[PDB]
From a paper:
SH1 is an icosahedral double-stranded DNA virus with an internal membrane. It infects the halophilic archaeon Haloarcula hispanica. At low resolution, the ~100 nm diameter T = 28 icosahedral virions comprise hexameric capsomers, each decorated with either 2 or 3 turrets (type II and III hexamers respectively), enclosing an underlying lipid vesicle and within that the genome. The two MCPs VP4 and VP7 form the crenellated capsomers, some of which (type II) have two and others (type III) three turrets that form the external crenellations.
To understand how such complex systems self-assemble, we have determined the structure of SH1 to 3.8 Å resolution. The penton protein VP9 (149 residues) surrounds the 5-fold axes and comprises a classic viral β-jellyroll, strikingly similar to the penton protein P31 of PRD1 (75% of the Cα atoms of P31 can be superimposed on VP9 with RMSD 3.6 Å). The major difference between P31 and VP9 is that the first 56 residues of VP9 extend inwards, in a largely helical arrangement to form tight interactions with VP12, which continues inwards to form a bundle of five transmembrane helices around the 5-fold axis. The MCPs VP4 (232 residues) and VP7 (185 residues) are arranged as hetero-hexamers (capsomers), underneath which lie, unexpectedly, less well-ordered proteins. VP7 and VP4 comprise upright viral jellyroll structures with VP4 topped by a further small (~75 residue) β-barrel inserted in the DE loop (the loop between the D and E strands of the canonical viral jellyroll), as seen in VP17 of P23-77. The smallest building block is a VP7−VP4 heterodimer formed within the hetero-hexamer. A six-residue N-terminal extension of VP7 is strapped onto the β-barrel of its clockwise neighbour to stabilise the dimer, if and only if, that subunit is VP4. Key to this level of assembly are protrusions of VP4 from the perimeter of the hetero-hexamers. These are formed of extended EF loops (that lie between the E and F strands of the canonical viral jellyroll), which bear a hydrophobic tip comprising Phe 155. Secondary structure predictions, knowledge of the minor capsid protein composition, their relative mass and the protein size inferred from the density strongly suggest that this protein is VP13, and an atomic model has been constructed.
Numbering used by the authors:
A (entry chain K), D (entry chain L), F (entry chain I): 8 to 232
B (entry chain k), E (entry chain e): 2 to 174
C (entry chain g): 8 to 174
G (entry chain i): 2 to 88
H (entry chain J): 8 to 64
Write the structure that this text describes.
């Protein structure tokens, strides 16, 4: 006897762990979904249960004369659902924040091949700006961990590239992602979202303008009671 | 702590970054240079059913799109790379596509004609026929998405290991 | 099987282009001749992409009239046997070959043999600027969508071609 | 033994008539499709054979300092296909020509409710511009006339509002403008299209840039031989 | 030179411009005032079968769409102007609608629920429930398109003159 | 009815393609034998059908005093299928032409292994002289293309080393070349002879003395009416 | 557009630049070093019969012919790299 | 048809991998034994075939 819930950035319990990867290009644990006392068991079903992943990373720059443009950000940027111009997209490819003024920036335009962007407000010399764009490259998958901390086995031993999650309009029914495989938890067990990517990804930067969480990993699941 | 045992038929999609596929930057006017080069993964077997989509997101070095009158071609070859002539799956252009949505809505999902079946060493190649005026090919910025393994739409490709009489009847081409 | 499902365009050695003056419709704009050994079959309900433009790359006048019309082996039109007649302006060059909801199809089937000819006739007003099939082109049919339709091509098989030569 | 052709502005003969209406509101003949000796008989079928009608009228203005805007044009304008911005449309709602410079003009923007527009190029004082906007309100229908010149009657006396032809994306299947009724021609007989509305439609402006005919009538039909 | 006869069933659409319907401007926050008002055509019968679209292009005087909070209602009345409670066909909001394409694509189309029928003096009315913050209603710059008489999608509205047994059964309300 | 007849550099038809290869080792199309409307079909048969091939490249040098000798030529030179001294050979291994004086020049001596030679006379200091020697390494094969310009089959997919076409005298039965594989043409189709090689090849050098054509490809086939 | 089907037994030759054969320059007087190596092409099978010719054009960096007293040996090995003596 | 061998620091081929771990308490791959083309297969049977490890920092 079961119903449908979702695991989330917070999900059904304030024990879910959020850690970030390494700069040495080697796969790490992004997230640990640890099953709680409250529940009996958790089920995932690829090809039934949808999933959503808005990753978002961090860069920083210092200002001076002529800095209406920000560089190729070491990230192969992609349009969103094919769409380019910001205000029409499902979500912003990137956002940025001037720290000294302590304000948000609106963006003029983008160049995806050279991976550069063009703003409206020329920041001040000596000033600091943070940027939070999407993440580009990246290979993810699911891992199983017992109560002891031992790896049991990966799910569907075929990684998923990151950028499909950007390429598809994630909200449209049918277009949303359905990965492969199955997996089942027990009480004290854990499952782990693993990723390999070269750039560091973030969560929970205080200076974000739109929300207290920059990046989200939501997933649909079946639950027993 | 169960995972769920699996069938051998892994349903996936194919792209450049995988370690059985190679890219190559190309000039304008050779319809014979292999832009892409797939090979058998040394032990497994691949099956593309007829009725499979493509997304050949091909661009130039300046990021812009190629000439729509360009013709893309896909073709099977031998273990030495010599095309067999027959066994073609595709012959059409880029202008038919719409990179904004060519892998989203089935109304635009251009697809194959025939089936395909790769042994442990067979090869698929992808070719590009253009006039001179274009800004060539830049695979480093361009990519390809073959099939889908995520949607209620489209189809995927079946990877399998070796099951005995399956392979016995499969090698009878 | 012997049946091959393809498309057709200008850059093929069974097809001829001929740049056109202003408003001389009787001239053959394009021409398709048989391949002398194979046989072509078109079914009705088949798209066209007549990407016609000027020397300066701009689109022609929408009020142009276009015809695809069969001719005899002599090259003379039969009058009857037309497959299509519409205006350029009905189409949308940005997507006329892409969305089926914008695709525009034939109104009849068609069959071509080793000597038959198809012609393309083009009636343009006075003021416009010719037609240069160098910068313009055409693509007929598609073999990629589950929607749309291809064109069938065959070598000479006995009984079907025996039927086919009853025209 | 029949086939499908199109009758149109010019079509299969240089005897088809095109004239304009009057400003006093009482309907008139816009187009006359006369049948030739070339054929035997022509057929119309409402709800089967597509039809297309791009009406476009004429306005005139003199310029001066600050005359970037053009006033209420006595013309009820609609965004084509629902879409407001110009280049996203299937065709321009409006076009502009300076006669003094003798050149096309690009348009900046529109207000549809006020029925006003804003150009890009400020004109000169003493300068003259003409404008080719769509036609808005008005009522249309077909009509039949014998070889003699006598009314036989109309077809389906429910005049379609003119702006419907502007509303739908005519170039898309399933949305194309069909009508109700049928009619068959004979040799020297003539069908006509009739209209009534306040403003004077126009064809054949030599100074117009984008084509040798501003406004078009087209209609798929069936023919015997 | 013949036209071909017709059924009495004329398959049309309905709109403000026709000479048997009245528009009226609306203040802020009265649902009860009738924006639209059809009257019987004095001799003919109208029939709106089930599954019939609407396209209520309502705007303000300044061309903007009204607030989506407003609810639109269509309702039959007697031969004096008084509703029946029953016979309602539609009660929804403008937030449902896409003025850019509401009368275009069947996916976005909004159809009635119930059948409906009209004698020589019967009446239908439109009622518009609004908060205070709206910018009223401008009927000159707004309109409606009820039904479709052109498309291979949607449906039409039947109109007929009085024929004997047809009206014998049609007056059976 | 058929005949045995040869296609060649010019042969029956002045439409056959002759183009040059690439320096990057990518197998490219040396020659294209396109079939005309004149004929019906063609047939080539390895192990039956003779072939003949004199490939040759083009290099250049500048003159200085004492420079009666040319260095290694980026080409592994062979004798002409049995003989070392040019005057007794089927053809020269190489020829030299001074451009300033504008004349052919006599060759004196060779080191085939070191790929060097010595001439009849000393050029002027600052002059330019070009040389047309045979080709060395490279692998060659045959391919077919439909009228549609798309591939239809490699013939016997195992190329042959180029050097043998030098290292046998081609005009002697037994010594002539009979390859493997068979192939049949149609009207608008085209067969293509392909090569991969380090070096460039040439045709139609204006300064070549012995003819308009520095190199030659010929093949005997059967022809259908 | 035909080509003619083939018997399985393809009659070919062999040369240095093929992707199942490798070269390696040797020092002065090392015999145990294999100058040239050939390996199976992973899926096909080769058959050489006796009376098979050789053009073993071995030269130096300057290309001049070697000491003619040099000895050449050709030998099948195991799947590891060890010659057999036999064969 | 099988015999015994030793895989090791150098072993049957110089295609193995020999690297060092990280100081953050997260496992790594110290050694990688990759098979060559020479052999059809390699097999290790715990409880049968011994293993030796002399680590040193």
């Amino acid at each position: 006897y079961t119903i449908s819930h979702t695991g989330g950035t917070l999900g059904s319990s304030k024990v879910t762990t959020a850690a970030n990867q390494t700069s040495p290009q080697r796969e790490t644990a992004i997230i640990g979904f640890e099953c709680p006392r409250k529940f009996a068991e958790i089920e995932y079903v690829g090809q039934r249960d949808s999933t959503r992943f808005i990753p978002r990373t961090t860069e920083s720059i210092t200002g001076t004369a002529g800095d209406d443009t920000v560089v190729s950000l070491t990230a192969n940027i992609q349009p969103v659902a094919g769409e380019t111009a910001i205000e029409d997209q499902d979500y912003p490819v990137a956002v940025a924040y001037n720290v000294t003024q302590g304000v948000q920036v609106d963006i003029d335009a983008v160049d995806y091949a050279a991976d550069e962007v063009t703003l409206a407000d020329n920041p001040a010399d000596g000033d600091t700006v943070k940027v939070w764009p999407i993440m580009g490259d990246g290979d993810v998958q699911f891992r199983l961990v017992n109560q002891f901390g031992q790896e049991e086995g990966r799910v569907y031993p075929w990684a998923t590239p990151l950028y499909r999650w950007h390429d598809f309009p994630q909200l449209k029914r049918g277009r949303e992602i359905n990965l492969h495989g199955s997996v089942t938890w027990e009480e004290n067990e854990t499952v782990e979202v693993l990723l390999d990517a070269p750039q560091a990804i973030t969560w929970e930067d205080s200076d974000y303008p739109e929300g207290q969480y920059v990046s989200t990993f939501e997933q649909d699941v079946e639950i027993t009671l | 702590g169960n995972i769920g045992n699996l069938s051998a038929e892994k349903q996936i999609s194919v792209y450049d970054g995988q370690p059985f596929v190679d890219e190559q930057d190309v000039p304008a006017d050779d319809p014979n240079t292999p832009a892409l080069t797939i090979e058998g993964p040394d032990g497994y077997v691949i099956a593309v059913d007829a009725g499979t989509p493509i997304a050949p997101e091909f661009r130039d070095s300046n990021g812009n799109k190629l000439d729509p009158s360009t013709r893309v071609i896909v073709q099977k070859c031998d273990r030495q790379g010599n095309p067999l002539g027959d066994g073609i799956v595709f012959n059409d252009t880029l202008g038919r596509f719409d990179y904004e949505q060519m892998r989203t809505d089935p109304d635009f999902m251009r697809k194959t004609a025939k089936s395909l079946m790769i042994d442990e060493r067979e090869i698929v190649k992808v070719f590009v026929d253009i006039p001179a005026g274009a800004n060539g090919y830049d695979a480093d910025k361009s990519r390809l998405t073959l099939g889908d393994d995520t949607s209620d739409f489209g189809k995927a490709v079946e990877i399998v290991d070796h099951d005995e009489l399956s392979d016995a009847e499969t090698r009878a081409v």
